[PDB]
Structure formats: C-alpha cells, structure tokens
C-alpha cells in the first residue's frame, strides 16, 4: 500500500507563475516522489539533468528537494545552466558551478501571451554587481548612472532597473514566453525522506 504520493500538480501547472526577478521557491519534503511521470511526459521542450541521470532518479534518495519556478523569454532558456554568462543569469537567477538537479521548461504561449501584450512579467536590467548563486533580489532602488544623488526621482541618468516583457503572439519562437521549473536536490547531515516509490 503505497501512500503519501507527492502531488507536484500544484507546482508544475498552477494558475499564476511568478516573475523571474521574484522567483517563487517552494520546499518539497516528506514526499514520496515519482519522477517517472515527469520523464514520460511529452509536453516538456527541454528536460536534461546534471549530476544525476534522468533514468535512475527513482533510486537515489534525497533529504530535501527545492523547486523554483519563473517565466522567461524563449531564447534565454540557454542561460539557465552552471557556468553560463548572460543577462538574466548575471542579474536575476544565478546557478552554482556544482549545481545538482535540473530544469524543466515548456512553451506557454497559449496562456502567458495576450493580443494587447502581457505586461505583468518583469526582468531586471541593472544592478551594481553580479549576485552570488541562489539569491533573490526584490528592492526597486533606481540604478544611478549620473553624478548627482538620484534620490529616486525618475529622469535622466537615473535608470529604472526593471523593465517588462512584451509577450505577444505575433513574435517568433525565440521570443515566446516559457515556464521554467528547476528542481534542486541536496544531501546533508539529516535522515533521507524524499525519494522513490519502491515497487512490488
């Protein structure tokens, strides 16, 4: 009698995805994880893993699972990888060099794009320095590039750090919005709880 099957339905396909600059992090724990359905699903455009091969994900057993979700431009999915330099990787979501886990993404043009242009998705263009891996920035202080104390009074050479995505159906595949979910596994000095469903 297998019990406590871990849902994943409230995480993989919800009705509201967060912006990339405020990526939502939901802890997964005390779960009987089943990644077979995720692998056998044919709706994911990209599903490739580091450290752990997708075939045997049901065997190794982990203490905790962290899932992060956000929505990014179609072409910018290549920047979500260890040791990659880009714009969103350097300013929004930075991955460690020795990252363990993988990312799952699929096209979401049928929901995240509007005829008049969906303007509810943001991505940061400016900040002082590159952020260390696994960090979230939310403050909206104006990135100054002029001499004076900007004081946040929007104008010339006090540039707004945050700009919006113009998601519209008429653009190409490289510009279509994509929903990205990254699963991160770790091991630490604690008993392992979140792992596969065995078999019988």
């Amino acid at each position, epitope marked *: 009698n297998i019990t406590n099957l871990c849902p994943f339905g409230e995480v993989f396909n919800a009705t509201r995805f967060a912006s990339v600059y405020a990526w939502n992090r939901k802890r997964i724990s005390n779960c009987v994880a089943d990644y077979s359905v995720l692998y056998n699903s044919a709706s994911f455009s990209t599903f490739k893993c580091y450290g752990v091969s997708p075939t045997k994900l049901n065997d190794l057993c982990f203490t905790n699972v962290y899932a992060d979700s956000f929505v990014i431009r179609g*072409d*910018e999915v290549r920047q979500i990888a260890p040791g990659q330099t880009g714009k969103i990787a350097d300013y929004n979501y930075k991955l460690p060099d020795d990252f363990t886990g993988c990312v799952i993404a699929w096209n979401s043009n049928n929901l995240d794009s509007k*005829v008049g*242009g969906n303007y509810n998705y943001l991505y940061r263009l400016f900040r002082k320095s590159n952020l260390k891996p696994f960090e979230r920035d939310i403050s909206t202080e104006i990135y100054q590039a002029g001499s004076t104390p900007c004081n946040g009074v929007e104008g010339f050479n006090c540039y707004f750090p945050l700009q919006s995505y*113009g998601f*519209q*159906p*008429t*653009n*190409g*595949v*490289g*510009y*279509q919005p994509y929903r990205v979910v990254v699963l991160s596994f770790e091991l630490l000095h604690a008993p392992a709880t979140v792992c596969g469903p065995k078999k019988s």
Partner: antibody, heavy 117, light 110 residues
C-alpha cells in the same frame, strides 16, 4: 510547396486594389504568410505578417493603411489611398516550420503594382 | 529597429574572399537570416540563426557573430555568386516593429 500570387494593375492614386496570394501543396492553418515589397532597384521592405492562429501584425512605416485577411486558400492583402511612390513589386512568403517566424523560405514569382495617371 | 549593412558594394577576383557586416541597433540574440537575390528573381534563404546553412546551399558561405554584430564571408567566390545580399532579424515586438531588412550590398566578380 508552391506559392503564387496575382493582381498587378495600373491604377490612379487613391483607388483601392486587391492582391490575392494562393497557397498550393500544404495546409495554410499551420504556416504564417507575410508580404514584402521592393521598389525598382532599391532594397527590400517589410509590410506585414499573419500568424497561423489568425493574429496579424503590421509595419510602422505603413502607418496602418493595409489589411491582411485569411481564408481557406486566399491570403489576400488590400490597400487604401495609394500614393505615387507605391509603384513596386510585391511577394508573399511562406515559412519553414512551426514557429520560427520570419524565415521566408518559399517565395512567389512576384507581381508589379504601378500607380500613375 | 535599425539595420545597417557595410560596405554597400565590394568586388573581388574569382580566387578571393570578401566580408559582409550587418549590425543591429538592438540586441537580437542569434535571430538573424541572410538572403541572396539575383536580378529579377525572388530571394533565396542562405543562412538562418546566423550560423546554420540552409538546405541545398553551398558550404563556401559561412556566417558568425552574436548579439549586435554579425558577419558573412564567402570563400573562393565563383562567377555564380554575383548578386545582392540582405540581412534580416527579429526585434522584439511592442518595443519596435517585429522585423526590418537591411540596406543590402552588391557583389561583382571580375
């Protein structure tokens, strides 16, 4: 996959004219057709595009005097209030595959629309 | 939103090579294509994504570049390459006007 169009005529300024581009050898509802034009001896210009779903986009320099309509096998375009600088050659272009817009790998033979008195 | 091609015209011998540069006013990732238009004929797609050769084209045409600077160079240009070339790339949407074409360059072989 063969794409052809016709409708070139000599018209006075301010008179509407219709060009119809007819598809052949594929399903229209899967690929996006677009219209481009070039003046005699000058560079290419972009006019507009219609995606497979039915949504349409245009060009700013056109200012919004064109209209692309879709149907079974007639990706037609209609203009209004033509000027004397619209004498050019028009093409209708097909795409490569699903998505990957603005590739324009199949082209029609080309038709010439001239405006004069 | 603005595409620029330099030089406008360039000539080389049959056993020679020439370069074509097409710069974009905005970051466009790698979404850029090239065309070849012989006089009186519809343009033919040569390279898409700025580094992938189209089907049925020769391997003496190569492309490169990413971001805002791109370059196309033909090696050992024959007498069949005498035509005009254009560069086209996407440019977001609302911000600008989807797609624009470059001014084009003319190539003549002696």
């Amino acid at each position: 996959q063969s794409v052809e169009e016709s409708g070139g005529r000599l018209v006075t300024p301010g008179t509407p004219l219709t060009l119809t581009c007819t598809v052949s050898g594929f399903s229209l509802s899967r690929y996006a057709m677009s219209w481009v034009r070039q003046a005699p001896g000058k560079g290419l210009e972009w006019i507009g595009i219609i995606v497979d779903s039915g949504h349409t986009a245009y060009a700013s320099w056109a200012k919004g005097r064109f209209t692309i309509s879709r149907t079974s096998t007639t990706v037609d375009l209609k203009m209004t209030s033509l000027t004397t600088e619209d004498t050019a050659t028009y093409f209708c272009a097909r795409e490569t595959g699903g998505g990957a817009f603005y590739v324009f790998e199949f082209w029609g033979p080309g038709t010439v629309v001239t405006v004069s008195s | 939103q603005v595409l620029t091609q330099t030089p406008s015209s360039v000539s080389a011998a049959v056993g020679g090579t020439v370069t074509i540069n097409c710069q974009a006013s905005e970051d466009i990732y790698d979404n850029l294509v090239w065309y070849q238009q012989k006089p009186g004929q519809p343009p033919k797609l040569l390279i898409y994504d700025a580094s992938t050769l189209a089907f049925g084209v020769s391997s003496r045409f190569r492309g490169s570049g990413s971001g805002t600077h791109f370059t196309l160079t033909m090696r050992d240009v024959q007498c069949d390459d005498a035509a005009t070339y254009y560069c086209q790339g996407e440019f977001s949407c609302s911000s600008g006007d989807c797609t624009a074409f470059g001014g084009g360059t003319e190539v003549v072989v002696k």
